[PDB]
Design a protein around this ligand. Structure first.
Ligand SMILES: [Mg+2]
Ligand SMILES: [Mg+2]
Ligand SMILES: [Mg+2]
Ligand SMILES: [Mg+2]
Ligand SMILES: [Mg+2]
Ligand SMILES: [Mg+2]
Ligand SMILES: [Mg+2]
Ligand SMILES: [Mg+2]
Ligand SMILES: [Mg+2]
Ligand SMILES: [Mg+2]
Ligand SMILES: [Mg+2]
Ligand SMILES: [Mg+2]
Ligand SMILES: [Mg+2]
Ligand SMILES: [Mg+2]
Ligand SMILES: [Mg+2]
Ligand SMILES: [Mg+2]
Ligand SMILES: [Mg+2]
Ligand SMILES: [Mg+2]
Ligand SMILES: [Mg+2]
Ligand SMILES: [Mg+2]
Ligand SMILES: [Mg+2]
Ligand SMILES: [Mg+2]
Ligand SMILES: [Mg+2]
Ligand SMILES: [Mg+2]
Ligand SMILES: [Mg+2]
Ligand SMILES: [Mg+2]
Ligand SMILES: [Mg+2]
Ligand SMILES: [Mg+2]
Ligand SMILES: [Mg+2]
Ligand SMILES: [Mg+2]
Ligand SMILES: [Mg+2]
Ligand SMILES: [Mg+2]
Ligand SMILES: [Mg+2]
Ligand SMILES: [Mg+2]
Ligand SMILES: [Mg+2]
Ligand SMILES: [Mg+2]
Ligand SMILES: [Mg+2]
Ligand SMILES: [Mg+2]
Ligand SMILES: [Mg+2]
Ligand SMILES: [Mg+2]
Ligand SMILES: [Mg+2]
Ligand SMILES: [Mg+2]
Ligand SMILES: [Mg+2]
Ligand SMILES: [Mg+2]
Ligand SMILES: [Mg+2]
Ligand SMILES: [Mg+2]
Ligand SMILES: [Mg+2]
Ligand SMILES: [Mg+2]
Lengths: 123, 281
RNA sequence: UUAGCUAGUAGGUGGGGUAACGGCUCACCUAGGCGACGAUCCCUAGCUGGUCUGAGAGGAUGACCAGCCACACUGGAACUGAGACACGGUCCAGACUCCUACGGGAGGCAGCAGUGGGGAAUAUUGCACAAUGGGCGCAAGCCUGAUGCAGCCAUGCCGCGU
RNA sequence: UACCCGCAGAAGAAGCACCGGCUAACUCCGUGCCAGCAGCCGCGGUAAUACGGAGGGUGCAAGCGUUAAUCGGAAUUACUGGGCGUAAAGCGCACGCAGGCGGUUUGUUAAGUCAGAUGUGAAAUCCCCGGGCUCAACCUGGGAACUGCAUCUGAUACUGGCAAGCUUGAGUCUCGUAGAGGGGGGUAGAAUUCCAGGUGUAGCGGUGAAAUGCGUAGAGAUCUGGAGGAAUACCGGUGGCGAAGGCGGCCCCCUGGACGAAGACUGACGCUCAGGUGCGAAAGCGUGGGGAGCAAACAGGAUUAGAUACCCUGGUAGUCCACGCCGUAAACGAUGUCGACUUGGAGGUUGUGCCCUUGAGGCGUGGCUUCCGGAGCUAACGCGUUAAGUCGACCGCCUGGGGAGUACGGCCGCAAGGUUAAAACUCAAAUGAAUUGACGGGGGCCCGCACAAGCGGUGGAGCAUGUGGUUUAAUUCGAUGCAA
RNA sequence: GGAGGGCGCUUACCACUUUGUGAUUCAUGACUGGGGUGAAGUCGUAACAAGGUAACCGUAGGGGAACCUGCGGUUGGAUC
């Protein structure tokens, strides 16, 4: 635009929309799951992911992701949901921590023990 | 109340007047607009009823080409002589003279593979209905030779909607000398399933009534107070291709069939059509 | 993707009110006022001295220290007083929490601790008026969850040790 | 309690992330598109430096990862500091108010601008110079800064206001020329078809085969004549005219724009723009006419286990005309307008002069239009004295590809719809230009029985247990175009 | 005794209400639309690389499905 076209209409910047629909100025969010089922990831991949729906407390039903070689969750239990970015699962944009609250973690693990709540064995 | 009530015929005549969409009975369309009054925006009533004429309920628009059917009837009935050495010899000639007329579209044609084995295997569970009805009689009105091969002689009256096809097949009463103990009349069943009969032949019903609404099939059988029926569907699964996209005319039955007076009697799956036998208390 | 808004709203005189200038509050007279240099309305947000990012121009933010304004269960209104339409004053209406011999009354942690609930998350029902500051008193003295400290969590910065 | 002193005693005190390319830093095993990480590109089918585990190394440390918010990165919101031919980007094209902006000479004023001084911009913090808790963090003195605003006192290059002038941009007018510029009447010819005579009768129209239509109540074809309607062949070249759209017969009236040319007068009445107004092909609509052809729906005949795609035979709207509404295109020159600067040559059209127009041309001075090309500009193709080059004034649109030029809310309509103009979700792209090559229901170039031809064969419903059909007294077995 | 004060009495504005009547707004929603992605139709073919193939723009009529026809427009153009 020319200099005269800037004193009437300012530069309207973007809304800075993040990759998450809502966050309530909160990094993590606690929810409760309803049903446990498995879906199909994408056309190239060929794996079975834990695509489970977890209903939050603000009235939003967003589907997260549960990673691990086997979790032991119950239909009526609290589930903490954090942030994450996954492309192989369309419609999914959240993860799920383990080893905290009513969710257990994996055992007999040494490398990458800072996540999934794994504990240090006494060697 | 012209906003909604003088704005039903402005919509309805237009379909039933145009020679391209005129393949319908006035009552059939009188119904399908009071149903769809509150369905699409008040400036888009006739406009999106054309969606039910193309995306849905189509090919019946333009119709089945009766001016191609008689073109293959007058070119058919005047091919071989009429060996009618007696009165049932007018039927055996009328048998093949009729057979090919149900074989232009590949639907009642996949039915002509069942003219000797599955037109009597159905009488062992309903009797021999002398009060009979039929839904979707597009090209299935010459089943009488085989229906009466067993001894069905009661009123068989199939109801189609394409009038350019019903009148290209109703003239046959005397032109083809079809039996004189049978009537036919127009009518739909996504709109009009009211009456009482004994056998309810459902040939081209398929899931076109379950296309008018999501999961609304168990309604019609009951509306026509009844006893039994016969309901078939295509099974043209191409070596594991049409699986799922063609195996639903069933799983919507057994599942939904717990709770009311409806039950099931028998079930088969041969040729290209899987017939259903139904019961009520 | 809110286009006109406004009849005590604009202006003169007189009267009246306030510690003071004023349609703040009236009568009369007049037909003007504001507005694409963005009037009104809706939504949202405290502002400033700063901090954070960046070499700057900018953008974002308004926590702690500090200036100023507004609020004191939810509304409205008034008195005492030099300064307030009053946070631990009072009267009254409504809601909620209690007591009572059914005539009925009292009270406010958006103060420091602490409890229940919501939330991925933030403390001990502590010590002392020694210093500082404020109110009262001639002085002494007393009051002062403001301040000065301790305890708790590695939240951050910095240093040291294993 | 800080600090200080003494005794015993290496005793109680180091984890975590990463370990494909970004981005420094690897071996094997288990598992085999199965079980699993995750920021991007992605990895995972008996050899994983991308999973898990062991070992090793690196980053870093009382902290290492992940997640959330802002900024830098991001020139991915460009006043500092980018584009608009083809990538997502100039409105179909103009006249113009409120705005922005406006040459030359002189003078005044001193708003803007510039300089000096005063007042003020509270403390911490940021900044600079030092000191003090053992040091640092923290804290602190002094100085500077707070880019701002206001008053007083000056200068007068530019800008702005007022007054007074000039001409280099040129308005207008006199004297001329060129044009389908636009509109209202009238006139002529050819052709199709209809309506009337004479003459001539089983064929005519039409599709590679067939048929429908049209004919013995005078068809088709031909001559003459008449009625009605529409379009202007050769002349006709990317020529001319207009802002764009658009408009080609001679031709009357009314009337506009542009350009040439020797001389006067008036002295920037100048450029551009939101809203608004006006124009805007074709198609479509409302109120009235015309209606011979052609031609969207509709229907006769073909055709095929379905052509409302194409072929053939007819026709209602529409095309034409008077009066209105809607304002939609590849409305493209994918290029807004105006002004100024800038190596040149070669083809048309249209004015005014010189020269021997005696060789119907050279040599000068303008408008419009086409092509090539250097410097320069741009990714590339190209543009390249009509700018998309080099400067300046004004405005509009576009901030990834789909959803979507949509829905909703206003405006514009008797309708069909248009204009202004989103939020979610999905995806790691999308789109452009130049290459290298495959390929094409391959032709201009091209070599060979490349198909033949000229002395002659193989090809035998027998068989040579090598053998092109039935075979388990075939199968304990090979190899399937002297290109497997 | 008066002045005047105070209580009562009463008029003014005025919160809480209360009956009708609109605007904006808000949360679910009874009746729902189309998109959307998972899916998935051994379709070039009703025209078997011969039953002899431009792409698009605006608009109208036919839109079982991308289309196809009328009118005008453009180059941004299968064998050619
Ligand atoms: Mg006054
Ligand atoms: Mg920067
Ligand atoms: Mg800095
Ligand atoms: Mg800054
Ligand atoms: Mg606070
Ligand atoms: Mg007082
Ligand atoms: Mg209190
Ligand atoms: Mg409270
Ligand atoms: Mg809780
Ligand atoms: Mg003191
Ligand atoms: Mg403390
Ligand atoms: Mg890892
Ligand atoms: Mg990696
Ligand atoms: Mg590993
Ligand atoms: Mg930036
Ligand atoms: Mg090109
Ligand atoms: Mg426009
Ligand atoms: Mg102007
Ligand atoms: Mg000045
Ligand atoms: Mg100054
Ligand atoms: Mg020091
Ligand atoms: Mg300092
Ligand atoms: Mg200082
Ligand atoms: Mg001076
Ligand atoms: Mg000016
Ligand atoms: Mg001046
Ligand atoms: Mg002047
Ligand atoms: Mg003319
Ligand atoms: Mg004649
Ligand atoms: Mg004759
Ligand atoms: Mg003639
Ligand atoms: Mg005529
Ligand atoms: Mg002179
Ligand atoms: Mg003069
Ligand atoms: Mg202009
Ligand atoms: Mg037209
Ligand atoms: Mg028009
Ligand atoms: Mg018309
Ligand atoms: Mg054009
Ligand atoms: Mg354009
Ligand atoms: Mg021109
Ligand atoms: Mg060139
Ligand atoms: Mg360019
Ligand atoms: Mg986008
Ligand atoms: Mg997007
Ligand atoms: Mg050679
Ligand atoms: Mg073998
Ligand atoms: Mg394009």
């Amino acid at each position: 635009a020319t200099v005269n076209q800037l004193v009437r209409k300012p530069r309207a910047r973007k809304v800075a929309k993040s990759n998450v629909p809502a966050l309530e100025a909160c990094p993590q969010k606690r929810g409760v799951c309803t049903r446990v089922y498995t879906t199909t990831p994408k056309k190239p991949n060929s794996a079975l992911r834990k695509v489970c729906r977890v209903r939050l407390t603000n009235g939003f039903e967003v589907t997260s992701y549960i990673g691990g070689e086997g979790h032991n969750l119950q239909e009526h239990s609290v589930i903490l949901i954090r942030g994450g970015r996954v492309k192989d699962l369309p419609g999914v944009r959240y993860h799920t921590v383990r080893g905290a609250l009513d969710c257990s973690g994996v055992k007999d693990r040494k490398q990458a023990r800072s996540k999934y709540g794994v504990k240090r064995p006494k060697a | 109340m012209k906003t909604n009530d003088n704005y039903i015929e402005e919509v309805t005549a237009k379909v039933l007047t145009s020679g391209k969409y005129s393949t319908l009975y006035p009552p059939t369309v009188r119904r399908v607009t009071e149903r769809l009054f509150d369905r699409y925006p008040p400036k888009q009533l006739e406009k999106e009823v054309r969606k039910k004429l193309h995306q849905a309920y189509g090919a019946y628009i333009g119709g089945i080409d009766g001016k191609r059917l008689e073109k293959k009837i007058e070119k058919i009935i005047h091919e071989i002589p009429n060996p009618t050495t007696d009165e049932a010899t007018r039927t055996e000639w009328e048998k093949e003279i009729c057979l090919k007329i149900l074989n232009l579209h590949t639907s009642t044609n996949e039915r002509t593979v069942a003219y000797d084995e599955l037109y009597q295997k159905i009488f062992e569970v309903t009797g021999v209905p002398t009060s009979i009805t039929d839904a979707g009689c597009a090209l299935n009105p010459f089943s009488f030779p085989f229906f009466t091969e067993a001894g069905m002689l009661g009123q068989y009256i199939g109801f189609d909607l394409d009038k350019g096809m019903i009148e290209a097949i109703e003239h046959s009463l005397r032109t083809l000398n079809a039996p004189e103990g049978i009537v036919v009349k127009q009518g739909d069943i996504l709109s009009d399933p009211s009456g009482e009969s004994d056998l309810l032949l459902m040939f081209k019903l398929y899931t076109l009534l379950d296309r008018q609404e999501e999961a609304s099939g168990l309604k019609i059988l009951q509306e026509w107070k009844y006893k039994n029926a016969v309901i078939s569907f295509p099974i043209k699964t191409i070596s594991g291709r049409d699986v799922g996209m063609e195996e639903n005319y069933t799983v919507k039955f057994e599942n939904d069939l717990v709770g009311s007076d409806l039950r099931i009697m028998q079930k088969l799956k041969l040729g290209n059509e899987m017939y259903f036998i139904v019961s009520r208390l």
